[PDB]
Design a protein around this nucleic acid. Structure first.
Length: 2010
RNA sequence: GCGCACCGGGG
RNA sequence: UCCACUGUGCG
RNA sequence: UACGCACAG
RNA sequence: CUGUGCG
């Protein structure tokens, strides 16, 4: 059929009219190979001809470039709002009348009317929007029936159509549904986007009122900056600067800022950090251990000597629980009497227990525990009861007190039983006894007295002599201290949930209330330790910081302290986790020979540090451990910043912090001593993980007001230092502030250095005119560009970056809303109201505590300079009692983004929701604008703070309009920066390349530079960006779009320059109160911080600082992409300058301010030879960075040992695990609301932890801790929460569903095997589409057990036994989800509609409203551990119809049936056995149970759909022989195994079209009114179609669980850092009767194996001679033809066709194909120049060279250029490349001018010339040859004619002038230069397919151990050298492709295959390879000097190729 | 024994 | 009455 | 499509 | 109106 295709191509070429506008599509037709793609292209060409003739007839010009209506109107100068994306075929504009023409061809009357109405509706969409801007739209639809046109004869058209359809029929028979519904829709699938308007140009809509201020600023930007310098001038200036800098540095007038690393000096500096506060320098370990156990009350309690009925339960506990549950009902008759009755009942129960068995529980001396966690005394209880009984007896008037008391007790108990029995539980659940009600209860409790200790609380620090226990009993090696800490932390956390009952009585009076308090009434929690019973006693409720005491019945007041209860969570139920963490950290350095005598001390120090940070979670204790990271990073480097030691020191207060510092110093001295030089990497990572312990403390702030004040000080201080602070700016700017802005703009550009007398001034904000000019000139003249950045023209970002939808700014994050008084928004606080509020607050706070000068003044002030305050307060309070005053001082409010967006959309009449519509085309929109902002007001931000691990950080919050404008700027700058290489902020491939380059640099021991910058945000300014932009030229030959783009961006940047920032209200109030106190003499003096001075100076004159505007600060992350772009260009220039000075080269990667720099061999050699020159080069780099307003942080390090980039460390070829960070992350209080959400969040966190080197043995412990936390809340553990016996493969190759499958298989083995077999067979049948009927509704949408049995028996396998079907699990919320406690249409169709309707205004409004409602509902739910515990056991279960029940009610109902049998495992997973004979009649409770087998089958099927079929195999545990003893710190990078390729991925289009073709009514009524001509119109076809339709039908019919969601998802590919020992001990799922996939895999493996033993030609017989070959099986379809690679297009078209022929190259292009071309820079010829009159001395610069070339005969200029074309197919495996060469002969005109006289064209490739001209026409479509783009010439030849090299870059921009007619080559001017050889059949050599001495494509399947074993057995038996060669070739080929052998164990494979010759074979193979090769958990190499094989190990001793290694065999 | 901008919190 | 702009990953 | 959490700038 | 639970 290739002949038919050739005939079609020839007839199309020689019969189609040669029209230029038809060429491009014609080019798309002559390159396709698939018959369906060829038919689509032919039909598209016919439609193009039809529409072009139609538009020519109607007069409308053709839309050849496919621009939208808005783009077309913009090109004509019409300003229109954002419109729906519609691309008309033709357009015509007449003044104000727009005519749009769309042409289509339909030969089916049924398929004709709907297209017409669809086009009419599409035009009516734009009609109203066009009318809104006063433009009349006249739709014009041209429908036809026949493909007849004047562009081609009718007969040839008919023949072409018939031949195309016949070829489609004859080529492949897969889907013959090409009726006039599919192919006609497929024809218009060429709606590729050419870019959309950004919306920045819409600023032209408003009036322009820019004035002298704007032009003055612009002139200041252009004052003394020259951006037209050549390379020679900038080179000279750089040389001068370097010479002067080096001279002044050597002479000593400039400081170094860098020091060479001296380990002894660093250790000495670290030891003397706090030299003025610690007495000694070399502490004793034993003395430190002695001091540790006696430092604080908590530490003393943890290590003190303390110590059957405890397990036993008495009546007191039962009565307390029952009374608590009853009181929960809140009878609320009278709280006092109810509490008295409860206390009396509890006392009676306690008396009964003591009388019976003499129990001592529930009593603490003379007090006992009441119902509501109340510790109360018996004296008050008996007195109150006697008084109440006497009053009642004397008011009822004969009955005595006992009778009335018993009557009241019985009445209360009866009422409680009646109120409790109704819901789900009677009194029998609480095993109470009614015997406690005695006939003489009143007399029994009236004479009862108990003696004991008195509970107390100490509010002040006292001596340590009062501790009643020995303080050193517990050892540090045991885990007793951790368990005690866990119990204490749980008590502290539970202390927060005590409800605030009636206020307790006053225990003390006066000052004695804060010295020692005897507790008569208090609150207490109970915890048991080692058999004892302790009470935590407090007096205050809530989450605030408070004082606690620990009491015991034997002796009271063990210890009292202060604590914040919400900081002690991580220690709860985590005692084994921390012990295992410490054990692993110690075992990391266990094999160090010099540390063998210090292991015990190291373990003790580590455990002491961990316990200390857990027990005392201080903020300032968190920063020392963080700075330890930078210390250890600088320790192993070569050079470091000289301010590192100053940065390390942090202020400390308490003695615990100093003890922590001493412990850290001792540990560092022990580890990093001078006589230990054995294992540097292990000690380095040990110290790093010690440093990372700071994550264990918290992230939330300790105090809010202090944090806000610190952040404001950080924000304000640098501005005050600079000298520009404008106070209270107005919407209408004043003259003085504008003058100040201009003056500071001039000052910012006046930085000087290295030339002035004073010299450089480091760490000063500003930029230098000289270096700014040099940077701009270097960018403009093209010396910063690479050869790969000029292959294509630069697109204009103004018309190539799309706009942002309104829903891109929608979230729950806060946003500011302004307050308007009458017509203008308020911007200033009121002084009088503020001071009145401050006075009121002072009086209130003194009244609550003050119960001397201070007392007199406060009591005088409470009666409302001094007279002014009196008058103001009297006038305000009387005429304005605190709530409204407090709310009337604020000047702004907060809300959500969604609410603001909905309010804005409510005021827009447009159809689409875009940012440009909201900004400009709105009812409340600006009319004009100025330099300071639009007329609606200046841009506004407000200050806030952030919670993080470390120091403070301020944040800016803007309103909606400022956010929109900032988003516009960010999008523009992101589009601008996307066109240059080296930025990793928005490019993950760049990040991967950076990581690979860093690893390669470290492996070669080159110098590396890790850099961060100090205060990147608060130092950058928008003025710097504006100045840089005003001097840059992007389109050097299109200076018309650049002007307007720069103007718009400059206006926006000036708006950002004139922003106003709002000070927080709390800060202002605090400062006002401080000022009032200080002015009155109450406060002290002296310190008087600068911020306080500023506030006081403003207050004295009577001004409240409300807003501050300055030129210096740029928001924290507000302008991120602009900063990234500036950093990129600045670093490029700095590297260029460094390369100009020295001879070396630097490769740099930056993201925002983090940077990694890699030096080449030259710089490393220079460092090794000439240290002074290297150091001064570093100095010059620092100086140049400082000159460009970039300050290097003291955290930067230069060295050859360790590299790091964005927290990814690499040391000497090893991976650095981050264990402590993620261990601490997984142990924190995650804010969750339901158990399943918590379980999945913990699972995600544990997966992330496993990805970062945490062993699974500890992740299992973390999961067990989470399950224990769930069990504490008394929640049943279903088998769908967590898996606690996972392996490495469970996390690397499996998702959550796979883990659930593993757990279910573990629970019930020997029963899931039959289910797996049935599922395997069913999936195999379904993939071929076999049944597709029974599974739809007969089984899936039906009953469960019977349908499961029927499905199992249908396939021919044995059904599960009756015992298996009884297994079930208790599914709570089986009807409605759980009801949390508040403290204050098919689903697929809905999802599609939500995705598609997000662009339109109405759909956006609906989505915003529903999201607002959902967020409001969610935000009022109690979260955290306390909230989750309170929610559970609080009537959370929803009943059948509508009711709420306790979990205890359900459990009791289940317990009332004797057939249900519970079953539990070791880990606590509980399931049930429910026989089928009791499933009828008791339907009330059986509805909560679900069978396990059905859920297992569903989950397994979904996992097989998502991951692959391998999950259906039989799992097994392998017994692997261990041959090498790995070090406990030997890690390995691993890649998850993938099985889904790019052609198996399903997108939105497939689902939409399936819905259209399956449910036309639903598609028409839900999807149709939301369809535009967007990318959704594209129709792509995949082999997975029938199965996708089945899944869509299943999802539509039933909404139980999603099934199509698992198809649009794939397994992520990413590195995992795992342990070798754990990796080698994982389970395996093998695959096992003929399957198409198995057959094709076997065939591919056979071909791959036989490709190395011998070579053969890929004929039709050789491929058919193999045993495994799909000889036209029953159901091949496309499932078996896609896993074939290059042969996929051959066997279907040649093997299964009765055709005998060899395979050629043309049978290697599968899928849709398209071409892409690149233009290389032109090159000179050395010989031609030298033989034309250019002989003599070399020239000084490029200008001299061009002048010399100019003075030549007019034909002496000869250049050569090459254009490279590449054809790529949809199945990207082989690209067809060719090229065309152009020789230009002409003369060089004045300077940068090139006049072309003659052009010669040649070509080289394997492409027929019949299409070449067309390809050339494509090149003529670009603006390069039209003079609208830059033309570049290579500089390699030019450097041979220059005296001074290292002066130019790689390209030079030279404009070219040439007539267009000379460039129109037509099919005959091209002359071939290649060999012109006939096509040759391919040869199957090693690896892949080889052409004639050229490797085109390669195939490489996956090889297992069995296949390699059998291949070795087959090959090595014949000969050994052949086996060696084959193995070496395979290893080298796979290593060249960057692949790992992580699925094969070569050592054991060779041991098993060849028991006696494994060593020699391995040695020979590795010697042949001679490189590091990664295998299944280990890497091997061969050493030349020592003729052996080395294995990589961190515990090794030898060095080899940049890795530590040791001998494999001893 | 909290916070530890002197200023807050701790029946 | 309180917490911003981005990037990666998962549900 | 949203929402929620972890890590990083 | 909502917890009494130490694997």
């Amino acid at each position: 059929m290739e002949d038919d295709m050739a005939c079609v191509k020839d007839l199309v070429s020689k019969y189609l009219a040669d029209n230029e506008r038809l060429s491009r599509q014609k080019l798309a037709f002559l390159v396709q190979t698939e018959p369906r793609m060829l038919l689509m292209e032919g039909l598209k060409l016919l439609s193009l001809c039809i529409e072009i003739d139609s538009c020519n007839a109607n007069g409308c010009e053709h839309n050849s470039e496919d621009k939208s209506v808005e783009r077309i109107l913009h090109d004509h100068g019409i300003l229109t709002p954002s419109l729906c994306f519609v691309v008309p075929d033709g357009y015509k504009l007449t003044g104000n009348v727009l005519i749009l023409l769309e042409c289509f061809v339909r030969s089916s009357p049924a398929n004709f009317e709907q297209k017409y109405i669809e086009d009419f509706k599409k035009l009516e969409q734009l009609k109203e929007d066009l009318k809104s801007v006063d433009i009349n739209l006249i739709p014009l639809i041209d429908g036809r029936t026949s493909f007849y046109n004047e562009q081609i004869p009718d007969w040839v058209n008919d023949k072409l159509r018939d031949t195309l359809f016949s070829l489609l029929r004859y080529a492949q028979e897969s889907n013959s549904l090409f009726e006039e519904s599919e192919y006609s829709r497929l024809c218009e699938s060429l709606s590729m986007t050419s870019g959309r308007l950004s919306g920045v140009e819409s600023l032209n809509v408003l009036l322009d009122n820019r004035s002298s201020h704007y032009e003055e600023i612009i002139a200041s930007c252009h004052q003394g900056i020259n951006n037209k310098l050549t390379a020679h001038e900038v080179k000279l200036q750089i040389e001068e600067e370097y010479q002067v800098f080096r001279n002044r540095l050597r002479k000593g007038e400039i400081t170094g800022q860098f020091l060479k690393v001296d380990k002894s000096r660093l250790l000495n500096d670290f030891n003397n950090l706090y030299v003025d506060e610690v007495t000694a320098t070399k502490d004793n370990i034993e003395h430190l251990i002695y001091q540790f156990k006696r430092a604080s009350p908590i530490l003393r309690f943890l290590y003190a000597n303390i110590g059957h009925h405890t397990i036993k339960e008495c009546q007191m506990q039962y009565w307390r629980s029952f009374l608590n549950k009853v009181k929960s009902l809140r009878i609320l008759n009278t709280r006092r009497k109810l509490l008295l009755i409860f206390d009396a009942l509890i006392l009676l129960a306690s008396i009964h227990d003591q009388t019976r068995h003499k129990c001592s529980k529930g009593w603490l001396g003379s007090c006992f525990i009441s119902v509501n966690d109340r510790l109360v005394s018996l004296e008050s209880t008996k007195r109150d009861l006697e008084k109440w009984v006497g009053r009642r007896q004397q008011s009822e008037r004969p009955p005595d007190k006992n009778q009335i008391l018993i009557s009241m007790f019985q009445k209360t108990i009866l009422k409680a039983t009646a109120a409790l029995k109704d819901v789900g539980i009677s009194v029998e659940h609480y095993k109470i006894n009614m015997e406690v009600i005695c006939p003489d209860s009143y007399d029994l409790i009236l004479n009862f007295d108990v003696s004991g200790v008195v509970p107390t609380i100490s509010y002040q620090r006292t001596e340590d002599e009062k501790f009643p226990f020995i303080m050193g009993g517990v050892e540090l090696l045991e885990s007793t201290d951790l368990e005690r800490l866990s119990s204490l932390s749980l008590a502290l956390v539970n202390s927060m949930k005590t409800s605030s009952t009636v206020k307790l009585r006053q225990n003390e009076f006066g000052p004695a209330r804060y010295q020692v308090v005897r507790c008569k009434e208090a609150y207490c929690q109970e915890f048991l330790l080692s058999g004892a019973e302790f009470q935590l006693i407090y007096q205050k409720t809530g989450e605030c910081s408070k004082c606690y005491a620990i009491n015991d019945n034997r002796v009271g007041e063990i210890c009292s302290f202060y604590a914040d209860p919400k900081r002690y969570f991580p220690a709860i139920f985590s005692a084994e986790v921390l012990q295992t963490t410490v054990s692993t950290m110690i075992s990391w350095v266990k094999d160090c020979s010099e540390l063998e005598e210090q292991l015990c001390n190291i373990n003790s120090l580590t455990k002491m540090i961990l316990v200390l940070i857990l027990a005392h979670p201080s903020k300032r204790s968190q920063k020392l451990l963080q700075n330890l990271r930078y210390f250890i990073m600088a320790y192993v480097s070569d050079y470091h910043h000289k301010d590192l030691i100053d940065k390390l020191r942090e202020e400390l207060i308490t003695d615990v912090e100093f003890l922590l510092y001493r412990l850290v110093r001792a540990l560092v001295n022990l580890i990093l001593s001078e006589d230990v030089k054995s294992m540097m990497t292990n000690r380095f990572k040990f110290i790093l993980n010690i440093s990372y312990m700071c994550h264990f403390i918290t992230k939330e702030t300790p105090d809010r007001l202090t944090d806000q004040i610190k952040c404001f000080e950080k924000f304000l201080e640098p501005k005050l230092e600079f000298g520009h602070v404008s106070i209270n700016p107005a919407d209408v700017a004043t003259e003085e502030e504008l003058d100040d802005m201009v003056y500071n703009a001039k000052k910012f550009l006046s930085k000087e250095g290295c030339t002035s007398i004073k010299g450089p001034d480091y760490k000063k904000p500003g930029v230098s005119k000289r270096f700014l000019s040099l940077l701009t000139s270097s960018f403009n003249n093209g010396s910063l560009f690479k050869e790969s950045e000029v292959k294509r023209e630069i697109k204009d970002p103004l018309v190539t970056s799309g706009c942002a939808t309104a829903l891109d700014l929608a979230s729950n994050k806060s946003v500011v809303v302004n307050k308007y008084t009458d017509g203008s928004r308020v911007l200033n606080y009121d002084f009088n109201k503020l001071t009145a509020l401050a006075v009121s607050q002072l009086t209130e706070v003194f009244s609550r505590k003050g119960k001397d000068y201070d007392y007199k003044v406060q009591q005088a002030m409470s009666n409302l300079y001094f007279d002014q305050l009196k008058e103001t307060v009297e006038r305000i309070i009387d005429q304005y009692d605190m709530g409204r005053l407090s709310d009337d001082v604020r000047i702004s409010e907060r809300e959500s983004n969604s609410e603001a967006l909905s309010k804005a959309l409510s005021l827009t009449n447009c159809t689409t929701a875009m940012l440009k519509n909201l900004c400009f085309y709105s009812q409340e929109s600006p009319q004009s604008y100025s330099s300071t902002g639009p007329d609606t007001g200046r841009l506004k931000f407000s200050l806030s703070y952030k919670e993080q691990v470390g120091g403070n950080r301020e944040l800016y919050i803007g309103d909606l309009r400022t956010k929109m404008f900032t988003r516009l700027i960010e999008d523009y700058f992101e589009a601008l920066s996307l066109q240059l290489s080296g930025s990793c902020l928005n490019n993950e491939r760049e990040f991967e390349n950076a990581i690979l380059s860093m690893k390669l640099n470290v492996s070669l021991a080159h110098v590396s530079y890790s850099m961060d910058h100090s205060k990147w945000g608060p130092m950058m300014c928008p003025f710097l960006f504006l100045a840089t932009l005003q001097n840059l030229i992007f389109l050097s030959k299109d200076l018309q779009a650049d002007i307007k783009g720069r103007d718009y961006l400059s206006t926006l940047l000036t708006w950002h320059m004139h922003k106003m920032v709002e000070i927080p209200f709390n800060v202002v109030s605090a400062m006002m109160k401080s000022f009032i106190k200080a002015q009155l003499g109450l406060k002290k003096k002296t310190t008087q911080s600068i911020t306080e001075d500023f506030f006081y100076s403003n207050f004295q004159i009577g001004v409240v600082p409300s807003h501050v505007s300055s030129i210096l600060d740029m928001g924290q992350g507000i302008l991120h992409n602009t900063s990234d772009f500036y950093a990129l260009i600045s670093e490029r220039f700095i590297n260029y300058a460094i390369s100009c000075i020295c001879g070396g080269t630097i490769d740099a990667y930056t993201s925002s301010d983090d940077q990694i720099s890699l030096f080449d061999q030259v710089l490393t050699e220079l460092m090794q030879r000439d240290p002074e020159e290297f150091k001064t080069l570093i100095e010059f780099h620092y100086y140049m960075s400082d000159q460009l307003n970039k300050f290097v942080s003291p955290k930067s390090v230069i060295g050859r040992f360790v590299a790091e980039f964005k927290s990814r460390f690499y040391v000497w070829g090893d991976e650095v695990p981050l264990l402590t960070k993620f261990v601490a992350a997984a142990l924190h209080n995650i804010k969750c609301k339901e158990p399943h959400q918590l379980a999945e969040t913990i699972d995600t966190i544990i997966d992330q932890s496993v990805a970062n080197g945490v062993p699974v043995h500890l992740c299992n412990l973390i999961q067990k801790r989470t399950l224990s936390l769930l069990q504490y809340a008394r929640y049943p553990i279903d088998p769908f929460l967590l898996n606690c016996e996972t392996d490495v493969r469970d996390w690397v190759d499996g998702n959550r569903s796979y883990r659930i499958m593993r757990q279910i298989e573990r629970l019930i083995p020997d029963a899931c095997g039959r289910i797996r077999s049935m599922l395997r067979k069913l999936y195999n049948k379904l993939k071929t589409g076999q049944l597709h009927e029974e599974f739809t509704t007969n089984y899936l949408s039906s009953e469960h057990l019977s349908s499961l049995s029927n499905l199992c028996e249908l396939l021919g396998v044995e059904p599960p036994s009756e015992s298996d079907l009884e297994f079930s699990w208790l599914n709570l919320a089986a009807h409605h989800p759980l009801r949390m406690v508040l403290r204050q249409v098919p689903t697929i169709v809905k999802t599609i509609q939500n995705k598609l309707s997000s662009t339109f205004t109405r759909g956006a409004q609906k989505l915003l409203s529903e999201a607002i409602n959902k967020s409001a509902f969610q935000s009022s739910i109690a979260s955290g551990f306390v909230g989750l515990c309170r929610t559970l056991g609080s009537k959370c279960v929803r009943g059948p119809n509508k009711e709420s029940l306790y979990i205890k009610s359900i459990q009791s109902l289940i317990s009332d049936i004797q057939g249900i049998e519970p079953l539990i495992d070791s880990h606590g997973v509980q399931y049930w056995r429910v026989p089928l004979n009791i499933r009828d009649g008791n339907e009330g409770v059986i509805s909560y149970f679900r069978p396990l087998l059905w859920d297992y089958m569903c989950i397994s099927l979904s996992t097989a759909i998502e991951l692959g079929a391998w999950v259906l195999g039989e799992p097994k545990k392998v017994r692997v022989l261990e041959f090498f003893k790995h070090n406990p710190c030997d890690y390995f990078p691993l890649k998850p195994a993938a099985s889904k390729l790019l052609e198996d991925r399903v997108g939105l289009n497939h689902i939409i079209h399936s819905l259209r073709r399956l449910y036309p009514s639903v598609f028409e009524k839900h999807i149709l009114p939301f369809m535009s001509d967007l990318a959704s119109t594209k129709m792509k076809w995949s082999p997975r179609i029938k199965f996708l339709d089945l899944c869509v039908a299943l999802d539509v019919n039933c909404e139980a669980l999603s099934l199509v969601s698992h198809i649009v998802k794939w397994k992520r590919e990413e590195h995992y850092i795992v342990l070798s020992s754990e990796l080698r001990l994982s389970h395996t799922r093998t695959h096992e009767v003929v399957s198409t996939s198995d057959a094709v895999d076997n065939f591919m493996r056979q071909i791959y194996f036989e490709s190395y033993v011998r070579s053969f030609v890929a004929t039709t017989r050789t491929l058919g001679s193999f045993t495994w070959f799909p000889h036209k099986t029953s159901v091949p379809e496309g499932e078996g033809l896609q896993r074939l690679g290059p042969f996929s297009s051959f066997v279907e078209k040649a093997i299964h066709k009765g055709i005998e022929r060899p395979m050629f190259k043309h049978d290697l292009m599968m899928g849709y194909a398209w071409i892409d071309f690149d233009i290389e820079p032109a090159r000179f010829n050395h010989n031609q120049l030298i033989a034309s009159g250019l002989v003599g001395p070399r020239f000084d610069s490029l200008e001299d060279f061009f002048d010399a070339v100019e003075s030549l005969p007019p034909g002496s200029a000869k250049l050569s250029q090459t254009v490279r074309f590449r054809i790529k197919s949809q199945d990207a495996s082989f690209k067809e490349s060719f090229a065309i060469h152009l020789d230009y002969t002409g003369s060089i005109n004045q300077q940068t001018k090139y006049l072309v006289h003659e052009v010669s064209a040649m070509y080289s490739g394997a492409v027929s010339p019949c299409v070449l001209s067309d390809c050339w026409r494509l090149v003529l479509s670009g603006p390069t040859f039209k003079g609208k783009s830059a033309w570049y010439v290579d500089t390699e030849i030019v450097n041979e004619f220059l005296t001074d090299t290292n002066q130019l870059g790689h390209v030079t921009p030279v404009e070219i002038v040439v007539d267009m007619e000379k460039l129109q080559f037509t099919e005959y001017d091209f002359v071939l230069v290649g060999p012109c050889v006939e096509p040759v059949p391919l040869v199957v050599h090693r690896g892949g397919l080889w052409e004639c001495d050229k490797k085109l494509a390669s195939f490489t399947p996956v090889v297992q151990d069995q296949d390699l074993e059998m291949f070795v057995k087959e090959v090595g038996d014949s000969s050994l050298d052949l086996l060696i060669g084959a193995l070496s070739a395979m290893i080298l080929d796979r290593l060249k492709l960057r692949m790992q052998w992580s699925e094969v164990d070569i050592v054991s494979m060779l041991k098993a295959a060849m028991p006696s010759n494994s060593v020699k074979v391995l040695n020979a193979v590795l010697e042949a390879v001679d490189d590091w090769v990664d295998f299944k958990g280990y890497a091997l190499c061969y050493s030349k000097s020592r003729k052996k094989v080395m294995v990589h190990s961190s515990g090794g001793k030898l060095r080899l190729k940049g890795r530590t290694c040791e001998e494999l065999v001893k």
